Amino acid sequence: GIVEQCCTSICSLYQLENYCN
Amino acid sequence: FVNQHLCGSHLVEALYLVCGERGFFYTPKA
């Protein structure tokens, strides 16, 4: 999930936007 | 800002700034 992609590993704008509505 | 380890309130704030008026969903356990 998001914690795995952005917290435990380095985040990116591409991934963050996957969580916008 | 965006390209680093973002956890907890730090991650929530990034989603807030990036998504803007579109809003977002935060699911810690998924």
Token pair of B15 as six digits: 């989603």
Residue whose structure tokens are 């969580």: A19
Q: Name the domain count of chain B.
A: 1
How far apart, in Å, do the first and last CA atoms of chain B sit?
24
Method of determination used here: X-ray
Q: Which two tokens stand for residue A12?
A: 């990116």
Is B24 in Cβ contact with A13 (below 8 Å)? no
Q: What angle do CA B22, A2, A16 make, to 5 degrees?
A: 40
Residues of A in contact with B3 (CB under 8 A): 10-13
Which range of residues forms the domain containing residue B29?
1-30
Question: CB A20 to CB B18 under 8 A?
Answer: yes
